[PDB]
Design a binder for this molecule. Structure first.
Ligand SMILES: Cc1c2c(n3c1CCCNC[C@H](C)Nc1cc-3ccc1C(N)=O)CC(C)(C)CC2=O
Length: 207
């Protein structure tokens, strides 16, 4: 298990998301589904040039899996996945400019729901989750688990859970007062409202 410090800008962003009063938390789901859709677009594109990139799985889809016993909402996709380098440095480095611009936009009158326009929508997960675990598998790398409860650090470890083949699983460990997002009716409502036209099958599991 390796422990890393967040880039200073990202720590700032996470604190803003966690501390700012903002009732429209439901937009987190849209942002995570968007991330999945982007990752699916990417593997679909790459597979046109190299069809063997789907040897790790041909199905391109998104699953939403609520678990009331564990108080987790999981977003699973069979997208391109992320390498160790992506998890630790690449995506966070890129997120620096997006974070800066976002925080500047907020100072100018924008609101937290616009986070996606700045490429850092993933962090909206902290609107509803006390901890986020990201399990991911990219064709060119091993399966890893990234994890953070904020507070300025994250961890990365090789994952010894069930093999995924290819893709990403975002496990939201929900805050005690955000359990509405485990309810079938509520998830259905949010998907229909914000994610109606995603170009991949979204299956809402039931309990
Ligand atoms: C900016 C960002 C970040 C993450 N994703 C993106 C968003 C940046 C663009 N996403 C492309 C990659 C391939 N896919 C994804 C990336 C992210 C989340 C989910 C997916 C996912 N569901 O595949 C996750 C980590 C843990 C690296 C932290 C972070 O800074």
């Amino acid at each position: 298990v390796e422990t890393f410090a967040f880039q200073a800008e990202i720590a700032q962003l996470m604190s803003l998301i966690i501390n700012t009063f903002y009732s429209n938390k439901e937009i987190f789901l849209r942002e995570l589904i968007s991330n999945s859709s982007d990752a699916l677009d990417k593997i679909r594109y790459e597979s046109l040039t190299d069809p063997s990139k789907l040897d790790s799985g041909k199905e391109l889809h998104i699953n939403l899996i609520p678990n009331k016993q564990d108080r987790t909402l999981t977003i699973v996709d069979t997208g391109i996945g992320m390498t160790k380098a992506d998890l630790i440095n690449n995506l966070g480095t890129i997120a620096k400019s997006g974070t800066k611009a976002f925080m500047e936009a907020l100072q100018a009158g924008a609101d937290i729901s616009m986070i996606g326009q700045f490429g850092v929508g993933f962090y909206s997960a902290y609107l509803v989750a006390e901890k986020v675990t990201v399990i991911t598998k990219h064709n060119d790398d091993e399966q890893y688990a990234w994890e953070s409860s904020a507070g300025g650090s994250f961890t990365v470890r090789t994952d010894t859970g069930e093999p995924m083949g290819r893709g990403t699983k975002v496990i939201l460990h929900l805050k005690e007062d955000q359990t509405e997002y485990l309810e079938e009716r509520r998830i259905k409502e949010i998907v229909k409202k914000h994610s109606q036209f995603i170009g991949y099958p979204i299956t809402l599991f039931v309990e």
